[PDB]
Amino acid sequence: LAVIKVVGIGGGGVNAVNRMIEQGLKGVEFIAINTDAQALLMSDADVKLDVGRDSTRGLGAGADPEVGRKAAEDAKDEIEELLRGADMVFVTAGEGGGTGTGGAPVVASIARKLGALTVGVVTRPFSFEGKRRSNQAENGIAALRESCDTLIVIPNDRLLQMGDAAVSLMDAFRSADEVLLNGVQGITDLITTPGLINVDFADVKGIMSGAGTALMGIGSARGEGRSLKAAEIAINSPLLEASMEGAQGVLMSIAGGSDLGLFEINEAASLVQDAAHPDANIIFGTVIDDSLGDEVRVTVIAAGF
Amino acid sequence: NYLAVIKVVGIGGGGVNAVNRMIEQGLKGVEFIAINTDAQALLMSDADVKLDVGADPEVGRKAAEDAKDEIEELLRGADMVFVTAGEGGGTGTGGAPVVASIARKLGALTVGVVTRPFSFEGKRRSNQAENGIAALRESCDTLIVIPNDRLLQMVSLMDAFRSADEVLLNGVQGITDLITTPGLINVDFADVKGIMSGAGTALMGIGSARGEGRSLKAAEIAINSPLLEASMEGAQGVLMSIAGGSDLGLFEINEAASLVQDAAHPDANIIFGTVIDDSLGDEVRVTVIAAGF
Numbered sequence: 072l073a074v075i076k077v078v079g080i081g082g083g084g085v086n087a088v089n090r091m092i093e094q095g096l097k098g099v100e101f102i103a104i105n106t107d108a109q110a111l112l113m114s115d116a117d118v119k120l121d122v123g124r125d126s127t128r129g130l131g132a133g134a135d136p137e138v139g140r141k142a143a144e145d146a147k148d149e150i151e152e153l154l155r156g157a158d159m160v161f162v163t164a165g166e167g168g169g170t171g172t173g174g175a176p177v178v179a180s181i182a183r184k185l186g187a188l189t190v191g192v193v194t195r196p197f198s199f200e201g202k203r204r205s206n207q208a209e210n211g212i213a214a215l216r217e218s219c220d221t222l223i224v225i226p227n228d229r230l231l232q233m234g235d236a237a238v239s240l241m242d243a244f245r246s247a248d249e250v251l252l253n254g255v256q257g258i259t260d261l262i263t264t265p266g267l268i269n270v271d272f273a274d275v276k277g278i279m280s281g282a283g284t285a286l287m288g289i290g291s292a293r294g295e296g297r298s299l300k301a302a303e304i305a306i307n308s309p310l311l312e313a314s315m316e317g318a319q320g321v322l323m324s325i326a327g328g329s330d331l332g333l334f335e336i337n338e339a340a341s342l343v344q345d346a347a348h349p350d351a352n353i354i355f356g357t358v359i360d361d362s363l364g365d366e367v368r369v370t371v372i373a374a375g376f
Numbered sequence: 377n378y379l380a381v382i383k384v385v386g387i388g389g390g391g392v393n394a395v396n397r398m399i400e401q402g403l404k405g406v407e408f409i410a411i412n413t414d415a416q417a418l419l420m421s422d423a424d425v426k427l428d429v430g431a432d433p434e435v436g437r438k439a440a441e442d443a444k445d446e447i448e449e450l451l452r453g454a455d456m457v458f459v460t461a462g463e464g465g466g467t468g469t470g471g472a473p474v475v476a477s478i479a480r481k482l483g484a485l486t487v488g489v490v491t492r493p494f495s496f497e498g499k500r501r502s503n504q505a506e507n508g509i510a511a512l513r514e515s516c517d518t519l520i521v522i523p524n525d526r527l528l529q530m531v532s533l534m535d536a537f538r539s540a541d542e543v544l545l546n547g548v549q550g551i552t553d554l555i556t557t558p559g560l561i562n563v564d565f566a567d568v569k570g571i572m573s574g575a576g577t578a579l580m581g582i583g584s585a586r587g588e589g590r591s592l593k594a595a596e597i598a599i600n601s602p603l604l605e606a607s608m609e610g611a612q613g614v615l616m617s618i619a620g621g622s623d624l625g626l627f628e629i630n631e632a633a634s635l636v637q638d639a640a641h642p643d644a645n646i647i648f649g650t651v652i653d654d655s656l657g658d659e660v661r662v663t664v665i666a667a668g669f
């Protein structure tokens with residue numbers, strides 16, 4: 072029985088976590104960490120830690136990653152005591168600001184020192200947010216990559232090539248929330264709510280330990296050929312950056328109702344094998360989600376390029 | 377007065393987190409108080425009462441001494457006060473003895489709970505973990521000490537940390553449930569205060585079993601628990617609680633009570649009772665608190 076903790080750090084990471092809780096992600100503990108007390112009062116997370124209170128006064132790191140790093144580092148004994156006991160820790164954030172960029176690698180190092188399987192799931196900021204945010208994100212992601220077993224990086228620019236062409240700014244960030252949720256859930260649900268093909272904590276640990284930098288694809292479909300269509304959308308996802316063909320490690324999850332049959336699961340698995348690198352290690356798992364109706368949802372995590 | 381007022385104080389990050397765990401598990405019958413002692417960080421809490429007085433012990437001490445009047449008003453009216461800094465050190469280990477000394481000067485039966493870290497955790501300067509224990513011991517009636525090393529005789533690294541949190545919770549719940557939650561055998565609060573006032577250091581033992589002979593079996597595990605450090609023979613004050621379902625029988629109960637008397641020192645005071653927790657199914661859980669020598 073694996074204990075899984077999902078940490079959101081900074082405003083975007085805390086909003087993603089609220090989204091995960093709102094959509095009913097189960098079997099995990101939710102921890103919100105931020106440098107803004109008011110923002111934390113609105114969070115529904117199980118654990119809420121306000122950090123950098125004297126350096127920031129509950130107003131955020133003002134986009135300075137050094138302030139975020141030092142806020143997390145000063146609270147490190149306390150974060151450690153919140154994490155101890157976890158088998159698996161997710162660290163989620165929008166890279167580019169001060170709190171998430173700076174604090175995420177601290178939270179991840181602590182998880183990794185404890186020997187929890189440590190997965191980062193972060194976005195790169197949209198190009199329209201400016202060169203400073205993109206540059207801070209890039210350094211934040213390099214730092215985090217040193218501290219995580221696997222680091223899933225979602226390029227927010229690619230999200231604009233999905234969903235609706237007439238989205239607002241608020242919509243774009245809700246979509247970033249959703250994808251961070253998809254990243255976490257596509258993995259955690261293999262463990263907490265397996266279907267016919269059970270990929271347990273040990274299997275996940277074996278493919279994700281020390282895997283390095285990763286990308287994700289997602290796909291969903293209904294009606295005839297839903298499994299094949301969902302997998303083909305996930306494999307060709309703009310978030311995966313056309314790089315599925317080069318990944319050496321691939322974890323795939325297919326979610327559907329109680330009645331998702333082996334035939335459908337296997338058809339999706341077969342399309343994914345064919346698209347993969349010839350020497351790829353691919354693990355295929357299933358998820359029971361009875362709220363899905365006639366839809367199935369495929370998530371692909373690709374690493375080892 | 378007649379429903380004993382019990383206040384459980386978590387202080388510092390490990391203490392507030394312990395209290396938040398107690399709330400999450402539905403520990404009943406007590407009032408929870410979360411005291412944050414760090415200037416730079418605040419762990420939030422759903423405790424009834426919260427005080428933010430904000431990793432050095434001296435820092436926590438000074439912060440709580442500064443807030444001594446408001447802590448006093450939070451504690452006034454309690455018959456019993458538990459204080460803990462929970463797992464890991466920090467400012468809470470400095471604040472805990474201050475809250476304890478205020479509880480005790482008010483007349484409340486003051487019970488500290490403190491953990492000794494696992495040895496593989498290493499050690500911070502100035503012997504600060506033992507200084508915390510010594511200072512907390514000076515200001516409590518009873519100090520329950522949980523030696524985390526002993527858990528490894530009861531294991532993976534994650535299991536070790538999890539068992540530590542679980543036994544810490546039990547350090548409070550085994551006693552509070554005995555007092556606050558009816559069972560077939562109930563106790564007098566005066567007798568609790570009789571064994572625990574001025575008693576000094578105590579240790580705890582736990583045991584669980586199912587099926588035939590469950591009560592005897594869980595009691596036997598509890599009495600021989602590595603966490604008791606074989607202090608059962610010499611102990612002058614013993615509390616034993618047996619938690620189980622409604623159908624817990626008087627005969628099996630009494631067999632457990634008889635075992636504890638036999639195992640304990642001839643001159644021991646023994647307080648014994650049961651707790652009805654209908655969520656345990658066919659399982660029985662025993663807590664033994666051994667105090668004195």
Ligand SMILES: Nc1nc2c(ncn2[C@@H]2O[C@H](COP(=O)(O)OP(=O)(O)OP(O)(O)=S)[C@@H](O)[C@H]2O)c(=O)[nH]1
Nearest residue numbers: 081082083131132133134165167168169170171196
């Ligand atoms: N997923 C998600 N991402 C967001 C949201 N708001 C902003 N972002 C993204 O996250 C990045 C970091 O912003 P944010 O998380 O708010 O900063 P912070 O880490 O809290 O940093 P600060 O203390 O300096 S204000 C932004 O550059 C943007 O790309 C949100 O609501 N949800």
